[PDB]
Design a protein around this ligand. Structure first.
Ligand SMILES: *Cc1c(COP(=O)(O)O)cnc(C)c1O
Ligand SMILES: *Cc1c(COP(=O)(O)O)cnc(C)c1O
Lengths: 396, 396
């Protein structure tokens, strides 16, 4: 039965890690996968997280199955982070949240639900986008269409092109929007641009689906949720696939959420029963550990205060690395103005390196970046900044 | 978009828990979901598990993403449990294991992989079977066909009917076999019957898919794997979806495995690359906590010794409850001979109660059982045995 099975091409992000962990070379630098590193080049378990885990170890009395939608408190805390504490969506019981195995699991659950319960057949994703988006949607049997986004020449959000591209999207089509810290460009719409997009989708009949993976990494928790909230104020329906992998440094525990919003309480509940059915036929119910850690921290004032500071430190360190990256490049003889990098939000810098330069950095210098030229600024430290900038000027 | 979405019917197993947790009645008894309870009616975290968690809390230095297939040691330990320590399958590198979110996640991953990479269109499941089987396979777009199994009159495995039913399965069809402790009947083939089935599937060209969820609950770890091993000795290809939810009492951490076996090392690796692609488009990579607990316990002699004893205690307690159940029923005036129950393996007793009796037990007596008449013997204790047996004799 498996004789003719052709091997899958390696994942552009995840396969990079296999390569790097096989490179016998001593001074290799990993700027591939979107994982935070501290000044020492380590990815530590957050202190707030270690504290919550100790608490769980002392307080858990059972590992009995959670419900299909997970820990209730987790869902409540998630809605407040997304929409705001006194949100009308929350007060009108218009939103239902399912705890899922990461943000990826949330996108897959949303896709399956949409494919099997609605008339949706097409999902619009930005060009460029997180490589795994197409893959998740195609799995559920939906086709992926692209909308213009990045102006590679001016390293800018090409808003008119974005608008003109989306005019091809029909009423009933899903349009995927990144929450903030656009992966891979780091270029996000201004609040006005978000308001324009919100009235446009309400006018064109699009169903918005948000991929919210970096809340807290651009400006702050509440600020980073602005575009999404601008949308929630005017849409009767929307879906948010959020992740706690990066903002809680809980990558391997798989902590995410799929939030479904409908016009009213009764509609959302009916719709949510089908989402739960899609979950039961996939992984049954979600993993307790990471979500439990998130609920514990968000529910405890002291733990929350510590976590928020840790997130603030991650955000600030990336900002310092960005500045450092463009200065050192300038000092190392890089003749291009890489100043645009200072303008990007989040962990990633879309460098503008070509496929071959990215390939050469790897083969000749052991510097690993994604083939698209996306480099993880959070993987940079003052110690590896110089050899890294030396490698880059050499391939230009 | 969601206005016409019809509500899903509640899950026959999982929805039962919502009901029970809403029943204001004081003496309700839960014999629904397949979760172990100790003599006090609690589902404690195993001691071996608590010990491994303490160890992880002290020793983990990062929550960095695992690879798509999970913790390597977890996969190795899984193959030894399944096939045996000195297995040729292991020595010839013919098997590849992906750590998955529970046994359900493993079945879904196997389904997606089969749907997208092979010529398979039909999966055969026993009548009766775990209610969620049809649901998982239909999700991947495969159709489910049934094969005869249980003789309700003689409370026996109707082997000739099983054989005659499967003669309708074509070469290239998948035939799902339960490992041991058949859910829901508790009736399993003898070792000879397993050998007969193994030569028959090799002759008919069927691809065997095992749902192995109760290793350790019938007779022991190695004994419970007999039928599967009889199959592995003669098949070039097979898939095993195993679960650690029940034997490690790790229900909510979602710990399972999907093991792919091919004719050789190179074929299995090619085939596994596609399975990994199916995982990446679903939940990306697996949750670390529970699998890490399993790898820690299985890799440590002291922790393993403790775990094995705990599993032995669970097995023995269920055996005592079975005897107790049939005696008390006999004492309480139940006129049917329920002695057949003594012959069933695992947590479940297929009682023979009709849909209406099951419904009445619930509405009038607060005794919750699955509509099929499946009752969780592991949910019984000496304290609730009498009121439970009283309720049953009253609906007969
Ligand atoms: C990281 C990420 C995800 C999801 O990651 P999970 O690790 O599955 O939580 C989804 N979308 C974007 C844009 C991301 O960066
Ligand atoms: C419990 C069970 C499963 C899977 O359960 P998970 O909790 O998803 O690990 C699969 N098959 C059978 C027969 C089971 O009893």
């Amino acid at each position: 039965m498996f004789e003719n099975i052709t091997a899958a091409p390696a994942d552009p992000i995840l396969g990079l890690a296999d390569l790097f962990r096989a490179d016998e070379r001593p001074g290799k630098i990993n700027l591939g996968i979107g994982v935070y590193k501290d000044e020492t080049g380590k990815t530590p378990v957050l202190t707030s997280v270690k504290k919550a885990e100790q608490y769980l170890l002392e307080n858990e009395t059972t590992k009995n199955y959670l419900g299909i939608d997970g820990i209730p408190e987790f869902g409540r805390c998630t809605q407040e982070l997304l929409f705001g504490k006194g949100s009308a969506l929350i007060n009108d019981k218009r939103a239902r949240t399912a705890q899922t195995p990461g943000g990826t699991g949330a996108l897959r659950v949303a896709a399956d639900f949409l494919a099997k319960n609605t008339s949706v057949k097409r999902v619009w994703v930005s060009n460029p986008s997180w490589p795994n988006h197409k893959s998740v949607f195609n799995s559920a049997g939906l086709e992926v269409r692209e909308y213009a986004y990045y102006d590679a020449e001016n390293h800018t959000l090409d808003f008119d092109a974005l608008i003109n591209s989306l005019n091809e999207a029909q009423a009933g089509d899903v349009v995927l929007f990144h929450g903030f810290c656009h992966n891979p460009t780091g270029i996000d719409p201004t609040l006005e641009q978000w308001q324009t997009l919100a009235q446009l989708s309400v006018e064109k009949g699009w169903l918005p689906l948000f991929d919210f993976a970096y809340q807290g990494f651009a400006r702050g928790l509440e600020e980073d949720a602005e575009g999404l909230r601008a949308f929630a104020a005017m849409h009767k329906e929307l879906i948010v696939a959020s992740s706690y992998s990066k903002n809680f440094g809980l990558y391997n525990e798989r902590v995410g959420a799929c939030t479904l919003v409908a016009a009213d309480s009764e509609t959302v509940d009916r719709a949510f029963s089908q989402m739960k059915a899609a979950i039961r036929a996939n992984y049954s119910n979600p993993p307790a550990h990471g979500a439990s850690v998130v609920a514990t921290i968000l529910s405890n004032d002291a733990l929350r205060a510590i976590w928020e500071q840790e997130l603030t430190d991650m955000r600030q360190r990336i900002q310092r690395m960005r500045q450092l990256f463009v200065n050192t490049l300038q000092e190392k003889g890089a003749n291009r103005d890489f100043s645009f990098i200072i303008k990007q939000n989040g962990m990633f810098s879309f460098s503008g390196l070509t496929k071959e330069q990215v390939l050469r950095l790897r083969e000749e210098f052991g510097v690993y970046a994604v083939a698209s030229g996306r480099v993880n600024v959070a993987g940079m430290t003052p110690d590896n900044m110089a050899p890294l900038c030396e490698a880059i000027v050499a391939v230009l």
